[PDB]
Amino acid sequence: STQNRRALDLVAAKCYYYHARVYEFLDKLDVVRSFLHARLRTATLRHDADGQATLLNLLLRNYLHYSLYDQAEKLVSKSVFPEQANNNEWARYLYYTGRIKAIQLEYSEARRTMTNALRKAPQHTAVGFKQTVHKLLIVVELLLG
């Protein structure tokens, strides 16, 4: 995927995704965090929305699997999530950005992002993703009052 042309970026979306998944069993290597980073900024100048989003997701998942919430917050803010993105990608991003808003004492925004998330995961099936966003939505409403 280091090669050129703009069509390979798309299939490199799926590439990155499995890359992180397998890297994540043994021990979610934080080494990859830099690769992702380097390949992310590149994608922002090639303006590959798709790769930009997908990649940005696996990055956020990296910061979140550890306790680097501040580091994801200042990021989520300073960065622009692409406009065109497959919905699956948008549901990931809306579950993570909501997780973050939730931890820093801001149940306000959260309860409105959380929900948009639940309603973008594919309808017929999506078992786990939905099954967890519930465990959080249920608590953000309670917390909210």
Partner: protein, 56 residues
């Protein structure tokens, strides 16, 4: 592009515990706070505090 999920675990089941079934029920959070306690709650409160003997 994606279309999958496989990054979160799930639970799939055929042993399912029961609650109030919902078909167009009003599904009030009030009815899960009781257990058909209402016959019991009368009898026991009419004997304990004697309001079946002292008080009609």
């Amino acid at each position: 592009e994606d279309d999958e999920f496989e990054e979160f675990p799930a639970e799939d089941w055929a042993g399912l515990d029961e609650d109030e079934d919902a078909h167009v029920w009003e599904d009030n959070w009030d009815d899960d706070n009781v257990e058909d306690d209402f016959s019991n709650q009368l009898r026991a409160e009419l004997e304990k505090h004697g309001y079946k003997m002292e008080t009609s």
